[PDB]
Specification:
This is part of a larger assembly, with nine protein chains of seven kinds. Chain B has four helices and 13 strands. Chain B is of the alpha+beta class. Chain B has one domain: Glutamine Phosphoribosylpyrophosphate, subunit 1, domain 1 (4-Layer Sandwich). The N and C termini of chain B lie far apart (46 Å). In chain C, α3 crosses α4. The two termini of chain C are 19 Å apart. Chain E is globular and about 50 Å long. In chain G, the strands form three sheets. A five-stranded antiparallel β-sheet of chain G has the order 10-1-2-11-12. In chain G, strands 5-6-7-8-9 form a five-stranded antiparallel β-sheet. In chain G, strands 3-4 form a two-stranded antiparallel sheet. Chain G contains four helices and twelve strands. Chain G starts with 10 loop residues before the first strand and ends with a strand. Classes of the chains: A alpha+beta, B alpha+beta, C alpha+beta, D alpha+beta, E alpha+beta, F alpha+beta, G alpha+beta. Chains in contact: A-C, A-D, A-F, A-G, B-E, B-F, B-G, B-H, C-D, C-I, D-G, D-I, E-F, E-H, F-G. The interface between A and F is large, with 44 and 36 residues. β12 of chain A pairs antiparallel with β13 of chain F, so a sheet runs across the interface. The complex binds ligand A1IF8 (3 copies), chloride ion and magnesium ion (4 copies). The PDB classes it as hydrolase. Keywords: Proteasome, Mutant, Human Chimeric Subunit, Structure-based Drug Development, Inhibitor, Binding Analysis, hydrolase. The entry is titled "Yeast 20S proteasome with human beta1i (1-51) in complex with epoxyketone inhibitor LU-001i". Chain A is Proteasome subunit beta type-3.
């Protein structure tokens, strides 16, 4: 009944020293029933990464919508949208449906191509922006993700340390939610190279 | 299960160096009607305890009789009733807490919030709260209903932590309580100007002040708006 | 309604769909095909509310057949599924949403690969080696998790489905009057007339 | 998810070890088999408190039976004490799904399904809880009377794993039991954390998952 | 607590100053008397939002009328309020008193309760506080009182309404509408409570 | 949320706590509630965070255009009017509670606005979960003829009351001082009285600690020449 | 309608060591968005080297601790001053809670001490009396923030040996009292940051063969 | 509409005479002043059934009191009402004024509202019609009035309450309680409407 | 409630009762006997809420067994049905009624006649040549109204029951897993093992 917890799943993002990480579980359920082990929740438009939790139809629709919007942005601006600007585009786009919202918990992560500054941001379903320095969490195991992150996280982590921290924050958060897990992906993002890792986690 | 009918608003209280203070306005409200203008909501028990009651005034009058009936009963076959086997604040409190929790557990509560303020035999300050749910807590400052939102922030600027208590005099503590009662008059729609204040000091005993009034009110700025 | 299964094997996709149509305490029909050919290499099975099922099935069919004539070309299963999903995702915020769940089984003649898509009335799409809508999944998913292999032949695929229908005829409360089984491969769509 | 089935070689009993508070996983290491006596097991599904309290109580009633009658209680009787107790409580909202599995000489190997609506059923196979359908799918499609003790133990373990995987409210580990004429034998705690991968590799199954 | 009284020299409007949200006093020194023209005032009671939105619109309607047809009659101001309050009665919680001084008809008082009916009266009381002073006002009102008498009658009346009504308090503001123009009076707790 | 506004001799000051919350959880420990409608008109918001942010930006935009069309510094009464007619049109469904404060050619101004479209004038105002805590301090310590220094103190003390005594409020005190004939000065993290102490332990793990199934490189770049 | 339950907030934490146990709880008491107390003890020494906390509705928590404390007194009288063992304590508490199955105590209960072999014991209960022995348990408001951290930092979950690419799990070792207190303090610092109901004070009770010791730590008061 | 007032000579009780069943007047000349003792009387407001049931039990208890312990205090009568009203607060809609005359204590007025609380006052007003006369009664009541001044004050007070309240009306009956004993007074519409 | 039929022919009563026990989405058992022997020549079938059905049937069985020992005599089918109706009629006005419907098939050794009694959970008793409880009746009554003859043999009454079971297997939404069939005649109660 509560649309934000029919399909289940989680996204987390973190800033480090001249890098960011964004990670998500792979589950898609219909409540108790697991349906898919391959439902990725992290998409990318140029160098800007978007994670989306909540009702899966809306996850898909918003990804299709932001691909559309960033494609036209690039044809008219003759450059790739930057994380700060995309964040405003997500917030605008969600607030347009104020009285019929997309049941989603979006998370933006990426490095500014001109300032080299690592950037993350989260949103409620009507586009209120949360621009924490440290970390952003979203999904059915948000409570848990807040607990893991707030204890595990320290600033200015190197990409290979940050990978460990965000992986351990997601894994241990997911093992304590019935509607998350079933696999996980972590993106380590530097100014001009992006490593994608699939995690070994329990399949229950 | 009932609903409160005639009601009394905030009770406010704090510890100081040598005892406790408690105050409450003299109003019995009836929904939005300010019906009864001489209600006494501070009820002294012996010379070492004052009970302050907010909520249903019918349930308060009952609790007042329970306390009058507790004094009588403790004197029965008790040659030390005015000495070592006198009622303590902590005895009177624990009795009220027992009754409140039992009543809520029968789904038929005494629709009140209560603050027991007194000095023990050994001279220690006693200040404890209980309500219609049987929830109980102690703190250097305690207020009920509206007073929780507006009195505690002001009184906690004087006694923020236990270590502040011995640094707080009765004049400073009383000034803070008197000011708090003015702020509640400005801001609580079901408060009165007329209140009672009791001091329980481990040296000077129980001082009970009736018919106090909120004064030094600022209304001057009204003409400009 | 209630029984639509799909299993993608090596070189084909197999859709199995219940023959029962029940209104109230009567089974009105025991030979119902809960399927529509969208194009020669794409089949769609459907289950959900009375009326909505066929109105949605036939509507999608008519659009895909229109696209086929206009472009004298057959859309990929992926393209058809994306079209179908978006229709549902649009419906879910309509005055009266289409209450219909579909499996889309297609052979992609460009990639020479069978594909199964599972989409729910909200527009929730996933590509699966095997899928089911409603209660069936509660039995058949754990069953297939054990018995499935990616490199199974169509004959093994059909034996694996027989296992699924038997398990459903044993443990499901309602009588779904058997399944109609159809194979989508490189040579198109054919009905298995003995099951 | 809990199962128990009769075969040539006695009874197999297998349960997961997950407790849920809605979508919150409360524990991964909880026990769902109570050992009533050396020849009598009870399975637990439903209200965590209802299952623990009324089943350790059943244990007390079964002990008082053997003192009073100088003889260990029949599975039929042990089950009917529980079904009569929950039947007294019907509509008060007890939530309990149990299999009373045991051996006695007069009965042979015996399983009774008991639930808090007051249903009591004798049968060869039962699966109980949120993931019973999952377990039922693997169990029903591999079950023969003439399984070996080794094959039955594995089919029971694998049927739970199946439900552990698909059902969001089953998981943690598999607790395994074999019941003979010589009583019950514990056959270990198998964490799904290691068992899923071992079973996937060795059996070539679970192809749905990223290997 | 709001009232208007028509006397010899003109008309007097009076109000308390309390805006409450439940039992919390949001503002204890609000001005509930709002000018519509130079010598036409309203006193607002009900929703803070609903009364303000309305009063803003009536201001605009009379400003436009003045530009076209010169000074509107107090009756005309009352009609604009009635028209708004009657046509929007399903979504308005607003009780309005309109008082004005022209030079032809002199002092006039109109009251507009919830329905959006209009009532021309020698004096009007309204708001939660009014219930407690129907007896006192009825026994104390006379026609053809002086300014000093009318200000006193209104001071005493609202003094009582503040005392008994939890939804009324603060200062008593008045506005005197005579040939001479507009005079603003304030009375503070210390002055009126000891009456 | 705890927001206050306090008028003084030559201007108006506005203050807010820096905690944003999803139910009982804290999302942003150092959030900024102090928003800019025009260069010399700031407001602060409580209620639905999105709703207050949308409505500030929409009225900020229309005020910027109006200022250009009229060739005048924008006025607070204008921001006030636009806000109240928008919020009233939407019947409370736009959960925006704002203290609006500015300096303009007409002088210094201080207004509140509630989601239904009611507005409020005064020399001191408070809003949010923390509003009763703030108003207790304001009612106890506010006087006529406050200096700039006294009004900032009184504004921050009023936010502090909220930080300590209200669970809905916490972290730091943000201030903006709009003085007549001067640029607005926005003192982000004015007071910083809730710094987390050093943790007992580093939880930096040893590399290799996580089990990995598959690595790969992702192309973020566009398709290359040749 | 009268609602006989409320929520007094707060959070508690039980960790079992090799020859000790700890039961910690913040000292903040709340209702809605108001603070009732900055120091209202929630973790009680019940005698017989057992420490107990019932977090949730303080009226129900106080009533239960009181009834259990009484149960320990009446066990000394009825069984010749015999020491109530932790496993026996837990079963008694299951019966206390289940007694009120159809009007529950709204509390999450943790008890701690040593078992009859001198090893650290933690037992946790639901409201209606279901219970298990555990190495770790957070309860109350920030339970979801703290438990995952303890799965990771106490039972070394999702942690492998570097350069064993997931073949070998990090071996699960007993922790010093010094290392356990550090994980408790870090848990309540993290919990205070991200939860509005947790703060003011941390009270830890440490149970060894020598008895019950207390430690107190200030938390952020916002 | 009911009130009691304590004056020099003794105490006076008064009431309207209307019993209504919704907007229908069931009886227009009912006596709501009921004797508990020889110089103790109660005034009834609320449910006709609940007020009668209670007044009969109080009368019974005071008749018993009189047998055993002699003539009971006015306080004691108030006390018996308080006990019935408080202990049965979840099934009673009754608001009671109790007035009596001892030779020690002289005139005494007690009010027992819906709570089951009890209040000793120099005068008390209650019933639906009382809301409209709080202002009037507060302003006009003095201590140590004469019998004739007290009858006037009540006649004026209840006339207003009857005039404004739809739930009040008919005749004003009063009962004057003094050392001389009990005087019963009635005032008809044509007397009190023209005040 | 599942399917329970009865049909009285010349010299026997035949009771057919479904074998399925279904809980939510799972058929837990497909071999359930929905029958208790009450005495050697009286069989009772039952259907309704889970628990209640067995508990009520066994209770009745105990009570009749008790009678049979006490009097060393077998109550007539008429007497047992009167007993059973009265328990249900007492049950409906209880705190928690037995939610059970029963057929009682009995051979009266005195009158040498088969007797079928249909009794619902309200205690509504009727003697019938054929009867059913729940949805079964809606198909089987009109069917047997056509075919049934009063003088049919037991073989004919079994063929007539195969018709009833085929119509239910064709047109009933639920899979009831066939029936256990029992014959009550002068030689007692036996089970047909193949049906
Ligand atoms: C297989 O089908 C398994 N399904 C998983 C399962 C969790 O549904 C369950 O039925 C287990 C079996 C229990 C586990 C504990 C040991 C005895 C058997 N059931 C639960 O875990 C049970 C489901 C509740 C709803 C029927 N969980 C609870 O009762 C949980 C457990 C708890 F610890 F968290 C406490 N609790 C509560 O519901 C508590 C009493 N309530 C609240 O926290 C909310 N009240 N408030 N405020 O196992 C199958 C075997
Ligand atoms: C004399 O009879 C006065 N009695 C008080 C009164 C309520 O009848 C009132 O009408 C006042 C005065 C208004 C002040 C603004 C100018 C027009 C006259 N009415 C209110 O103060 C009004 C009452 C609501 C119910 C009658 N209060 C509010 O609108 C307050 C203002 C607000 F912002 F805070 C929001 N609010 C609310 O009532 C809303 C609905 N909020 C809530 O219900 C919960 N809290 N919040 N947000 O003056 C009489 C003349
Ligand atoms: C002054 O303030 C008076 N107000 C008038 C008053 C009528 O409200 C009343 O309270 C009187 C006082 C009683 C009269 C009986 C004798 C003792 C004093 N109350 C009633 O007349 C009473 C009002 C009920 C609502 C408070 N009326 C009834 O109970 C009448 C009597 C009845 F028989 F007719 C039945 N009945 C009902 O109310 C019945 C139950 N009907 C309904 O409730 C709804 N009917 N419809 N539609 O005197 C004040 C002192
Ligand atoms: Cl509002
Ligand atoms: Mg999980
Ligand atoms: Mg699972
Ligand atoms: Mg789907
Ligand atoms: Mg009348």
């Amino acid at each position: 009944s509560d649309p934000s917890s029919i399909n289940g799943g989680i996204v987390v993002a973190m800033t480090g020293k001249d890098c960011v990480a964004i990670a998500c579980d792979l589950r898609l359920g219909s409540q108790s029933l697991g349906v898919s082990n391959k439902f990725e929740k992290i998409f990318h438009y140029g160098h800007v990464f978007l994670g989306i939790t909540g009702l899966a139809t809306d996850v898909t629709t918003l990804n299709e919508m932001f691909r559309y919007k960033t494609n036209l942005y690039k044809l008219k601006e003759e450059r790739a949208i930057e994380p700060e600007t995309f964040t405003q585009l997500v917030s605008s786009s969600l607030y347009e449906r104020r009285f019929g919202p997309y049941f989603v918990g979006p998370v933006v992560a990426g490095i500014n191509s001109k300032s080299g500054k690592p950037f993350i941001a989260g949103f409620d379903l009507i586009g209120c922006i949360d621009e924490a320095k440290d970390f952003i969490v979203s999904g059915t195991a948000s409570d848990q993700l807040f607990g893991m992150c707030e204890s595990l996280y320290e600033p200015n982590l190197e990409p290979e340390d940050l990978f460990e921290t965000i992986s351990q924050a997601l894994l241990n958060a997911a093992d304590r939610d019935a509607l998350s897990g079933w696999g996980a992906v972590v993106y380590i993002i530097k100014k001009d190279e992006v490593v994608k890792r699939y995690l070994k986690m329990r399949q229950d | 299960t009932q609903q409160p009918i005639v009601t009394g608003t905030s009770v406010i209280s704090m510890k100081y160096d040598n005892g406790v203070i408690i105050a409450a306005d003299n109003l019995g409200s009836y929904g939005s009607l300010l019906r009864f203008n001489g209600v006494e909501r501070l009820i002294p028990v012996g010379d070492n305890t004052v009970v302050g009651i907010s909520g249903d005034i019918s349930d308060m009058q009952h609790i007042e009789r329970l306390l009058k009936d507790l004094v009588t009963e403790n004197a029965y076959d008790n040659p030390l009733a005015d000495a070592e086997e006198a009622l303590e604040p902590s005895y009177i409190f624990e009795y009220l807490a027992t009754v409140m929790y039992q009543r809520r557990s029968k789904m038929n509560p005494l629709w009140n919030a209560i603050i027991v303020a007194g000095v023990q035999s050994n001279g220690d300050q006693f200040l404890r709260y209980v309500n219609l749910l049987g929830v109980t807590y102690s703190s250097p400052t305690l207020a009920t209903g509206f007073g929780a939102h507006m009195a505690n922030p002001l009184l906690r600027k004087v006694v923020d932590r236990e270590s502040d208590i011995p640094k707080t005099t009765v004049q400073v503590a009383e000034e803070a309580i008197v000011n708090a009662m003015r702020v509640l008059y400005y801001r609580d729609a079901r408060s009165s100007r007329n209140f009672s204040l009791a001091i329980i000091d481990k040296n000077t005993g129980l001082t009970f002040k009736k018919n106090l009034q909120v004064e030094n009110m600022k209304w001057d700025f009204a003409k400009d708006i | 309604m209630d029984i639509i299964l799909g299993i993608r094997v090596q070189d084909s996709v197999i859709l199995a769909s219940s023959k029962a149509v029940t209104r109230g305490i009567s089974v009105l029909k025991d030979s119902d095909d809960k399927t529509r050919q969208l194009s020669p290499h794409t089949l769609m099975s459907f289950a959900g509310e009375a009326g909505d099922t066929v109105q949605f099935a036939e509507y999608i069919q008519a659009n895909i057949q229109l696209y086929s004539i206009r472009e004298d070309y057959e859309l990929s299963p992926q393209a058809v599924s994306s079209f179908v999903r978006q229709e549902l995702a649009k419906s879910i915020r309509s005055r009266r949403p289409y209450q219909v769940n579909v499996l889309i089984g297609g052979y992609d003649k460009k990639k020479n690969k069978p594909e199964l898509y599972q989409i729910d009335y909200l527009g929730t799409k996933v590509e699966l080696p095997y899928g089911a809508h409603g209660y069936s999944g509660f039995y058949t998913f754990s069953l297939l998790d054990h018995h499935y292999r990616p490199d199974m032949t169509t004959e093994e695929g059909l034996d694996l489905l027989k296992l699924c229908v038997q398990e459903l005829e044993k443990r499901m409360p309602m009588d779904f009057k058997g399944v109609i089984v159809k194979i989508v491969d490189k040579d198109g769509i054919r009905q298995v007339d003995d099951f | 998810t809990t199962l128990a089935f009769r075969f040539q070689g006695g009874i197999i009993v297998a349960v997961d070890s997950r407790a849920t508070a809605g979508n919150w996983v409360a524990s991964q290491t909880v026990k769902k088999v109570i050992e009533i006596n050396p020849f009598l097991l009870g399975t637990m599904a439903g209200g965590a408190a209802d299952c623990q309290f009324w089943e350790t109580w059943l244990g007390s009633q079964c002990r008082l039976h053997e003192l009073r009658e100088k003889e260990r209680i029949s599975v039929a009787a042990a089950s009917k004490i529980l079904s009569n107790l929950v039947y007294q409580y019907k509509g008060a909202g007890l939530s309990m799904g149990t299999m009373i599995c045991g051996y006695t000489r007069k009965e042979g190997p015996t399983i009774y399904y008991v639930d808090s609506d007051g249903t009591r059923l004798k049968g060869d196979i039962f699966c109980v809880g949120s993931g019973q359908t999952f377990a039922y799918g693997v169990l029903d499609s591999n079950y023969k009377w003439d399984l070996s003790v080794e094959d039955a133990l594995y089919l029971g373990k694998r049927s739970i794993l199946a439900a552990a995987h698909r059902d969001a409210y089953s998981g943690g580990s598999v607790n395994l039991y074999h019941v003979t004429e010589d009583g019950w034998i514990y056959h270990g705690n198998h964490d799904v954390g290691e068992l899923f991968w071992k079973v996937k590799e060795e059996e070539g199954s679970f192809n749905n998952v990223i290997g | 607590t709001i009232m208007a009284v028509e006397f010899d020299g003109g008309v007097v409007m009076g109000s308390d100053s309390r805006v409450s949200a439940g039992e919390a006093v949001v503002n204890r020194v609000f001005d509930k008397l709002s000018p519509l023209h130079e010598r036409i005032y309203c006193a607002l009671s009900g929703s803070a939002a609903d009364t303000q939105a309305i009063a803003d619109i009536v201001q605009y309607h009379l400003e436009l009328y003045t530009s076209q047809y010169g000074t509107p009659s107090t009756e005309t101001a009352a009609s604009v309020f009635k028209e708004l309050c009657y046509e929007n009665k399903d979504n308005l919680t607003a009780g309005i008193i309109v008082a004005g001084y022209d030079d032809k008809n002199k002092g006039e008082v109109y009251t507009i309760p919830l329905g959006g009916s209009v009532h021309k009266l020698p004096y009007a009381i309204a708001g939660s506080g009014s219930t407690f002073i129907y007896g006192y006002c009825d026994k104390n009102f006379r026609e053809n009182m002086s300014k000093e008498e009318t200000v006193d009658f209104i001071k005493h009346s609202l003094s009582q309404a503040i005392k008994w009504d939890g939804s009324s308090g603060g200062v008593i503001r008045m506005v005197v509408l005579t040939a001479a123009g507009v005079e603003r009076l304030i009375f503070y707790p210390d002055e009126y409570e000891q009456l | 949320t705890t927001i206050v506004g306090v008028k003084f001799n030559n201007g108006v000051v506005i203050a807010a706590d820096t905690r944003s919350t999803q139910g009982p959880i804290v999302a942003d420990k150092n959030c900024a509630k102090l928003h800019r409608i025009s260069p010399k008109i700031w407001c602060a918001g409580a209620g639905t965070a999105a709703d207050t942010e949308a409505v500030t930006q929409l009225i900020g935009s229309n005020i910027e255009l109006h200022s250009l069309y009229t060739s005048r510094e924008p006025r607070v009464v204008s921001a006030l009017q636009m806000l109240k007619q928008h919020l009233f049109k939407y019947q409370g469904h736009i959960g925006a509670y704002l203290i609006v404060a500015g300096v303009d050619p007409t002088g210094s101004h201080l207004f509140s606005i509630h989601a239904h479209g009611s507005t409020d004038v005064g020399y001191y105002l408070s809003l949010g979960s923390g509003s009763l805590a703030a108003m207790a301090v304001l009612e106890s310590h506010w006087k006529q003829d406050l200096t700039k220094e006294e009004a900032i103190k009184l504004a921050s003390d009023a936010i502090q009351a909220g930080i300590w005594n209200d669970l809905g409020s916490g972290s730091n005190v943000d201030v903006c001082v709009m003085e007549i004939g001067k640029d607005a000065e926005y003192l982000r993290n004015y007071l910083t009285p809730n710094v987390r102490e050093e943790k007992q332990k580093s939880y930096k793990f040893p590399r290799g600690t996580t089990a990995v199934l598959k690595e790969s490189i992702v192309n973020i770049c566009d398709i290359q020449e040749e | 309608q009268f609602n006989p339950y409320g929520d007094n907030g707060g959070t508690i934490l039980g960790i079992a060591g090799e020859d000790f146990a700890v039961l910690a709880g913040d000292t903040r008491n709340i209702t809605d968005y108001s603070i009732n107390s900055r120091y209202e003890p929630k973790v009680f020494d019940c005698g017989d080297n057992i420490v107990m906390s019932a977090n949730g509705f303080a009226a129900d928590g106080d009533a239960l601790v009181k009834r259990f404390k009484n149960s320990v007194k009446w066990y000394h009288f009825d069984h010749n001053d015999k020491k109530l063992s932790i496993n026996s304590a837990a079963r008694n508490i299951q019966h206390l809670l289940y007694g009120k199955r159809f009007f529950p105590y709204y509390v999450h209960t943790i008890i701690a001490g040593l078992d009859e072999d001198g090893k650290g014991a933690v037992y946790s209960f639901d409201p209606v009396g279901s219970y298990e022995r555990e190495q770790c348990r957070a309860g109350g408001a920030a339970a979801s923030l703290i438990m995952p951290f303890l799965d990771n930092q106490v039972n070394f979950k999702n942690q492998y040996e570097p350069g064993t690419n997931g073949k070998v799990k990090k071996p699960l070792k007993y922790l010093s009292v010094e290392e356990v207190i550090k994980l408790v303090r870090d848990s309540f610092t993290s919990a205070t940051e991200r939860h509005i109901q947790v703060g003011d004070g941390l009270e830890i009770l440490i149970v060894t063969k020598d008895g019950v010791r207390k430690e107190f730590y200030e938390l952020k008061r916002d």
